[PDB]
Amino acid sequence: EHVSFHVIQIFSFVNQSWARGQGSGWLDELQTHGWDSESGTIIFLHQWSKGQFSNEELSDLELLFRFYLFGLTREIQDHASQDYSKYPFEVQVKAGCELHSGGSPEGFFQVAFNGLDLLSFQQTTWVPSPGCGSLAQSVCHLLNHQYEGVTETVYNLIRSTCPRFLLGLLDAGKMYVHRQVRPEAWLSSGPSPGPGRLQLVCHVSGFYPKPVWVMWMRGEQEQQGTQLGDILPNANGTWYLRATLDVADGEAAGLSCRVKHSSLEGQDIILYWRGSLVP
Amino acid sequence: RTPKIQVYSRHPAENGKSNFLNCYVSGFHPSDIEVDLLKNGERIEKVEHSDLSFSKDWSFYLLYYTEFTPTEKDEYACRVNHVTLSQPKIVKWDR
Numbered sequence: 197e198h199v200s201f202h203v204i205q206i207f208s209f210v211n212q213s214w215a216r217g218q219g220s221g222w223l224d225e226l227q228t229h230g231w232d233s234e235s236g237t238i239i240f241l242h243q244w245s246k247g248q249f250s251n252e253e254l255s256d257l258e259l260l261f262r263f264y265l266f267g268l269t270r271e272i273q274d275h276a277s278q279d280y281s282k283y284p285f286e287v288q289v290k291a292g293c294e295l296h297s298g299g300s301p302e303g304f305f306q307v308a309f310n311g312l313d314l315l316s317f318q319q320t321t322w323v324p325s326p327g328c329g330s331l332a333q334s335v336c337h338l339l340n341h342q343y344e345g346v347t348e349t350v351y352n353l354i355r356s357t358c359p360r361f362l363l364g365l366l367d368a369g370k371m372y373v374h375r376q377v378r379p380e381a382w383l384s385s386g387p388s389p390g391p392g393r394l395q396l397v398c399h400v401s402g403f404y405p406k407p408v409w410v411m412w413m414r415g416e417q418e419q420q421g422t423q424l425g426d427i428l429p430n431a432n433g434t435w436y437l438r439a440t441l442d443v444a445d446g447e448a449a450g451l452s453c454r455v456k457h458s459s460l461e462g463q464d465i466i467l468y469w470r471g472s473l474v475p
Numbered sequence: 476r477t478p479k480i481q482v483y484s485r486h487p488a489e490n491g492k493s494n495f496l497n498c499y500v501s502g503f504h505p506s507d508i509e510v511d512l513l514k515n516g517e518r519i520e521k522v523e524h525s526d527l528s529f530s531k532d533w534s535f536y537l538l539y540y541t542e543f544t545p546t547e548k549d550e551y552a553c554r555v556n557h558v559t560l561s562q563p564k565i566v567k568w569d570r
């Protein structure tokens with residue numbers, strides 16, 4: 197039931213004079229916004245990506261992000277000019293909010309440096325990560341002391357502005373986020389487990405939402421050796437899943453793949469393994 | 476972390492039937508990477524990819540996709556070069 201909205205940023209600093217930034221907005225795993233880094237503007241990926249916010253609100257946010265990117269990818273280089281050979285390095289930022297089932301908002305703002313936790317924002321203060329050392333302490337010192345209401349602005353953004361935006365997005369995107377899309381399925385062979393053995397694969401693709409049930413069956417007996425892949429993304433907001441089973445040659449006959457999904461409304465997909473059984 | 480590569484079509488493969496080839500590349504770090512979808516060993520220009528994203532452990536992931544038509548003669552693949560790889564990895568699509 198917990199739903200979340202995150203703005204992510206990836207900064208790659210190659211040397212003292214050269215860096216590249218990338219940024220995007222995500223509603224759970226659904227990308228809803230991009231950033232045009234040259235014009236410095238928000239890209240609204242869906243008709244409903246404005247949420248319920250006004251154009252004045254969204255343009256003020258754009259300007260906030262611009263001022264911020266300025267300050268960040270200036271001060272970072274100014275300081276990393278001294279400690280070169282650290283180059284190339286990469287900074288990741290994940291800022292957002294999570295709404296719990298009772299409605300309680302929870303904000304976060306985590307930073308990573310070269311893929312390790314650098315710091316995070318816990319209450320009203322920037323706390324360095326235990327692992328990383330004096331670097332995290334330096335960054336936290338500059339944020340907690342030199343920088344004015346960027347701490348206060350982050351606070352209001354991730355605790356009040358972000359929940360409001362998330363809910364407005366869910367509402368504005370009502371017909372999209374509540375949609376049901378039916379999968380299709382098909383069988384294939386996978387890589388040979390061994391001589392005298394077969395790998396049966398049942399592909400299920402195009403379903404939404406993500407909960408799905410897929411099993412190899414012998415009539416009504418679920419086959420215990422079934423392995424479920426990870427649920428993988430398709431373009432345009434559906435999902436893909438592989439279910440596989442290794443079987444001895446001569447024991448594949450009679451096996452079927454069975455797929456259940458909310459979109460199917462009790463009409464499961466059943467596919468029987470044929471292989472080279474049919475001349 | 477090394478990139479993991481998964482290749483999959485959007486619909487059942489049918490020779491002579493338009494379809495989409497997906498390559499999902501994940502769990503890598505740092506973000507610099509070269510992912511190409513290949514037709515007969517040649518890079519496919521008309522490709523789409525998601526904007527870069529990362530998981531809770533900070534490893535990156537991307538989804539590539541391109542329209543394609545499976546053919547008995549044609550070979551399709553996903554090629555990844557990364558700083559953690561000595562040579563480009565290639566994962567070929569079959570079935």
Ligand SMILES: CCCCCCCCCCCCC/C=C/[C@@H](O)[C@@H](CO[C@@H]1O[C@H](CO)[C@@H](O[C@@H]2O[C@H](CO)[C@H](O)[C@H](O[C@]3(C(=O)O)C[C@H](O)[C@@H](NC(C)=O)[C@H]([C@H](O)[C@@H](CO)O[C@]4(C(=O)O)C[C@H](O)[C@@H](NC(C)=O)[C@H]([C@@H](O)[C@@H](O)CO)O4)O3)[C@H]2O)[C@H](O)[C@H]1O)NC(=O)CCCCCCCCCCCCCCCCC
Binds near residue numbers: 272339
């Ligand atoms: C919108 C609001 C946003 C707010 C947040 C924004 C920003 C937040 C964070 C910013 C930083 C905070 C953390 C800082 C922590 C500190 O702890 C800081 C300092 O670390 C220590 O510093 C020391 C500096 O001395 C290092 O020692 C040097 O190591 C080197 C190895 O590479 C060399 O061996 C060198 O020896 C020599 C040598 O051999 O070169 C000997 C010579 O004698 C000397 N020759 C002389 C004097 O002539 C020369 C000289 O000293 C150097 C070094 O000073 O200076 C110059 C020079 O004058 O030459 C200056 C000049 O400008 C520069 N040329 C140019 C064009 O710029 C030039 C050039 O040559 C090099 O560029 C290339 O060559 O170099 O140095 C050593 O000194 C030491 O290693 C290192 O640990 N640690 C860092 O990691 C730096 C920052 C890296 C982190 C970047 C990002 C992480 C944080 C991001 C998270 C963001 C937050 C998100 C939240 C924001 C929104 C809320």
Ligand SMILES: CCCCCCC[C@H](C)CCC[C@H](C)CCC[C@H](C)CCC[C@H](C)CCC[C@H](C)CCCOP(=O)(O)O[C@@H]1O[C@H](CO)[C@@H](O)[C@H](O)[C@@H]1O
Binds near residue numbers: 231257291349353354
């Ligand atoms: C590139 C990435 C873009 C990705 C596309 C997203 C697009 C889509 C549409 C997002 C929709 C909006 C949603 C709702 C985002 C809200 C919640 C997000 C999750 C949290 C925010 C995290 C970012 C890091 C914010 C950066 C600004 C920071 C906060 C410092 C700014 C300068 O401070 P300053 O001006 O000095 O703040 C100071 O405040 C003081 C007063 O207090 C003033 O006196 C000072 O002058 C000063 O202004």
Ligand SMILES: *[C@@H]1O[C@H](CO)[C@@H](O)[C@H](O)[C@H]1NC(C)=O
Binds near residue numbers: 210213
């Ligand atoms: C800094 O990196 C950029 C991009 O790689 C490159 O064009 C430029 O020449 C580099 N600068 C130095 C001083 O090597």
Ligand SMILES: O=S(=O)([O-])CC[NH2+]C1CCCCC1
Binds near residue numbers: 223225226373406407
């Ligand atoms: O994959 S899933 O089960 O669909 C996760 C919930 N859907 C979220 C992303 C799309 C917007 C609504 C919230």
Ligand SMILES: [Cl-]
Binds near residue numbers: 225226433434
């Ligand atoms: Cl989605």
